[PDB]
Symmetry: D3
Subunit: 282 residues, 6 copies
């Protein structure tokens, strides 16, 4: 049959920005249908409510098997509000956030919602003297490349593909809701990379990515001297740029061996697989 | 004065992906309020329709000073549908798209619509054999790095920022709507780069992102032999990855001359500017 | 048997610069003898004729099995004159040219001439303000790498050596003359690369090289505003530099797989073959 | 007035391959007229003689102010033969060779001819097991990039341009004939590079290119064990590839400072000069 | 007056490997005289005791003005014995260590010892399965590149140069001994880089280097699973390799601005200074 | 049985800096015990003698099985005094040096001393106007990287490990002492690289490094003009930097084939071996 879900996006995150598209890359999955609503970058308690009310507003006629909320710091005012509104609705919800979301990690099991906490999806150096729109874009391009090439996006894809199957089974229980925490070590469980050094390079990429957070936090919430915080947050961007280079390096190693894992979606939604370039998705 | 807008996102394009965030990079603007709605990757006449209705729906109470529709190919069934829906509504609308929209450029002005066509925002190789979620994301990472580091996003931002000023003047006419077609030569009319070699590299990056389109189509809708179109779409990706490298290069040149242009928004919406890293934006 | 030929070089084309040397790379080939005549970069109607005359003059005593004319744009005043002069001669001939020669592909087949059209051998951005002597050399370096590392030169070689064999059968008929149009898609129907990704990188590299031509054309003829054509002709050169680096990346990929295809000429003229580095060519 | 000269090319050398073209880059120099003749790669005493015989043969009606012979090792059988025939003609000649030509350096002062010996124009790894047509082209592309970007070609261009002036004065005396030896230290008497590190990098690139010859020679003429000579010549080619990278790196520094030295020819033949990209050749 | 000191090296740290050499880079200083002793890489109490006793026996007749002990973890048993032994002597002493030394910072002050703790001097992935002699050297090469190119070594050089001047006046009090903790933020207050982006890339390099320590600790002392720790320590090395490239990029930015800081020693000990390449130090 | 040795370090050489460490990479060997003494960068006769006397004085109660002296030029005055002193003692001794040691090769054999001369271990551009501490450290970082990644250090490790086993049997004869001369060709007959291009790239790195010596020598002892020798020595440092990148390139190829050789020491001193990342050493 056909499964449906709603995506609410407040504020920006590398994972939230891509989460719904990781489910139907070519737009040929006839077995799903999604809606996307949000308040852009804004994520204060007010805008959040309005967004979740905009999702509950259309879920009435849309009737989503599950709703997903994606944004930074799920333990902050704005996002906290939205955890409430979704925990108390006739819809199974999933909250996708970053590392600060480990604070309210217990509280999320309580509210009965699923979650995808990406640690390497670090906050960017948000300081007016440094972060303008373009810098903002450049940083996201480097983070997108590290989360994709290291195989973290695969984890999110497969997590929302294993749910979309239980959604067609007309049985979405809280035991079916994912409870994930993505980090460098997560790659130690997969078989993503055939070349071991590629895994080690992807691991290093994610380690660096996770570290970008502390640098951005310090420069934005701790250092108050212009002469010190501008360079600090900028150094957080230089780090992520390198993590992106490491990610690319990992991918190229897999190209040298012709083992680049590829798992596309069949028109009916079933996840295929392949390693060799001219292999034809199995 | 507080301007309002509604972004309709159907299908995916690099420009539509970040278009709204380019207007409030740090979420500190208190002169704007946005509501984003879309049907994700799917952009057929059915989904597109439901999305615009969804946007017009909330537009009654939101009261946007304008509505923006972004997605690939404005000449396609769905986009054309949305193009007539917005033209017939009492809302000043803008259409953001790729090269394929040119076929309906003279047609959009008659509908009284504003448009911004980004030629280098090329369609990716959407073959099930090559394009899986990861690959799609990686593709957009490079495409984003391109549109950002080459100055194209600052063009989009500039156009909308000037529009948001008009939206405050309580007067948005067909003359105040943007009618731009971005391409490699668009940089010739700007002073984005201080280093002349940074610009020509930037131009090369956009010229190459532009050619990527021909290959993606030649392998998605033209060629039908399995043994040819897979290598064809993958070759379009390699082109995008190197285009992104030329963009990174150009920016590193602006970094060596400490002439990296940054144009961040003040809390009141005012667009500041600076070249030197240590200088505050004025 | 010892085949012979006379290459006429008028103008500058990457394929005409190497054409004869790809036939006797180590100069230890004793089954062939060549004579090279030309008037340097000048390819005007006068110089072109004075060149073909020298070739026809030398051919009297030399007595070649065929005569090759290499230079840019066979459909120009100079090349056209030479195209006709050779057709009227008693000597078989082949025309080495770029994309601009396709205009006269049908005509050359009528004149009974043979031809090899290399689409990716793009014209350089010749605009006094940019293309000085050094820059010209530089551009030709990148292009030489692209045509060499992608496999285009091996296609040229396999065609000219297949002809020299028929030239030993002292009977070269128009049916034995080459009629090739090299471009990105040529690699698709070959086995140059053992590594798949090295192939699509080579294909990506060839597409870019081809696309440089239009850029150089736009800036050398169409655009007449100095403030714009200087940047444009330079952007085309930054593009070919990228194409060269891409070709290099492809060769290194073959190296990681110890599969660099090498096909050297034995002292007798036979084309040997090898993959593995320490493997003898047979 | 108008100056003329003939160029004989036997065997290949990076400088011998570009020599003529470095004097008329766009082919719009009306004050010169060149002719090019040779036997391709072959350079044995027989082929050489037939080549210098074909140059003197056309020099009858062409009446050249000076003839130039270019090819590897001007102290070998073939080339030595050509020094004889040119020293014994009514035409002033210039011998273009590589480092092995310093052996017959004094003997050439005696024969009364000029010479340009480029030390960094190293011999390649000419072994059947390594050097095929493709590899041979890859090497010349690297060599071409270093000879150009390091500013060596500029030295050769200036030399033949200072001669083409004294050739319009119909006074080509042996004193006006060039007696040059070019190597790493040539850059110390130049102004080629404004950035001191770009010069330093170029010096290193030349030093390495020069040292490549010693490796090639060993692998080709000294090491007789196939298991050792193949890797040796192959390493000589890896060295040249990095030299090309260093040269390129020097050029990029110059772009960074907007000081890329350009010396294009004026339509009448006088060498112009400029630094800034948009400066307009003066 | 000649300044005398004894350096003791037990175990290995980047900073301790180069500490004494940074004080006499050309070996032409006439104001210093050094003795270096140690037990190589072994830093257990037994060996460290022999090392210090070796130094104290030498001090008898050599009469140094100060003694330096350098090696990892000032808090470990072996280094602790050295601190105890040095604290009990009459010779002013300094402890060079890494992050773990912070645990005994209070103890060192109470012991009258000086110290320089370099946090970016990270412990390597010391697991037999991954660290052999060559990998150990590779890591050191990268670490050295990071500490030198970021400017950390100039901080250490600086500290000791002042201590040496005071020694020449036989007046080294406990309050003269350095108490430095070096890390990413140390660079914020140095006039090391003229290019702001070079400082930011360098800060990024030091941040990543510091991060390496944590990753090496996890793989060597926490994770006990062979399958998990081998990849973890190898990823630690990948991070250091990338940190080295950042330091290298910063160094190349200074070169582009012909602003690389050099502070060589004059024959009489005076520390000169310069920026421009051809500028003489003073 | 535990082997004991003393290492004497005077002056600085890449190999003398790492020698002892390569023998106990993780400090977990039970079969060895070393003592290190030296006079830092100073290697004049007075200092060298003071150093050797320190060693021989320790030797009395330490009872070393063999003594190693490492540092620049075994033929210089200082090093020569060391050779005379050690050749005059009862302790078997090995001299670690650079190319200039070849001069006293016969003299060393007549003295009953062993030797390992590392030709690529080149002297740096030791000119005050260029070489300050930071640059000295950066040069050694690249040289170390070269000596490690190319396998030169593995050769050094092997020579000493063999000598160590002999020591454990109290049987070190003058015929057991090494007489090695390491250079580019040394790599031709080792098992180091599985990939041939990695071996080739490693050879290229050694050739360039070996060549760096001559450039530094020219700039330090021959050229006397500040305006010539500054750029000269600096170009020696740019060469080394590229030799390091080639060594890194060779290492990355091995990683692509998961054939990176690692020969770690077992606790009992046994030299293990492995190739595959996940493969345990045996
Ligand atoms: Mg005291
Ligand atoms: Mg006390
Ligand atoms: Mg003895
Ligand atoms: Mg004896």
């Amino acid at each position: 049959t056909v499964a449906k879900a709603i995506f609410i996006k407040c504020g920006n995150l590398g994972t939230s920005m891509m989460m719904d598209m990781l489910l139907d890359e070519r737009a040929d999955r006839e077995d799903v249908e999604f809606r996307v609503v949000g308040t852009s970058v804004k994520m204060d308690p007010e805008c959040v409510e309005a967004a979740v009310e905009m999702a509950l507003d259309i879920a009435e006629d849309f009737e989503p098997d599950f709703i997903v909320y994606g944004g930074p710091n799920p333990a902050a005012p704005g996002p906290s509000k939205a955890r409430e509104m979704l925990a108390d609705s006739e819809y199974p919800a999933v909250i996708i956030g970053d590392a600060p979301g480990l604070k309210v990690k217990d509280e999320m099991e309580e509210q009965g919602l699923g979650y995808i906490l990406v640690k390497p999806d670090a906050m960017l150096g948000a300081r007016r003297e440094f972060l303008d729109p373009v810098e903002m874009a450049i940083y996201n391009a480097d983070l997108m490349k590290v989360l994709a090439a290291t195989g973290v996006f695969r984890v999110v894809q497969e997590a929302f593909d294993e749910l979309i199957e239980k959604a067609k089974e007309d049985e979405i229980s809280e035991n079916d809701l994912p409870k994930l925490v993505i980090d460098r070590n997560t790659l130690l469980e997969r078989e993503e990379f055939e070349n071991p050094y590629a895994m080690v390079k992807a691991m290093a990429a994610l380690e660096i990515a996770e570290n970008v957070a502390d640098v951005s936090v310090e420069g934005c919430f701790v250092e108050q001297d212009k002469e010190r915080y501008v360079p600090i947050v900028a150094s957080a961007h230089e780090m992520m740029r390198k993590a992106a280079e490491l990610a690319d390096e990992a991918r190229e190693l897999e190209k040298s061996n012709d083992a680049v894992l590829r798992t596309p979606h069949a028109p009916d939604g079933k996840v295929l697989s392949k390693r060799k370039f001219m292999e034809d998705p199995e």
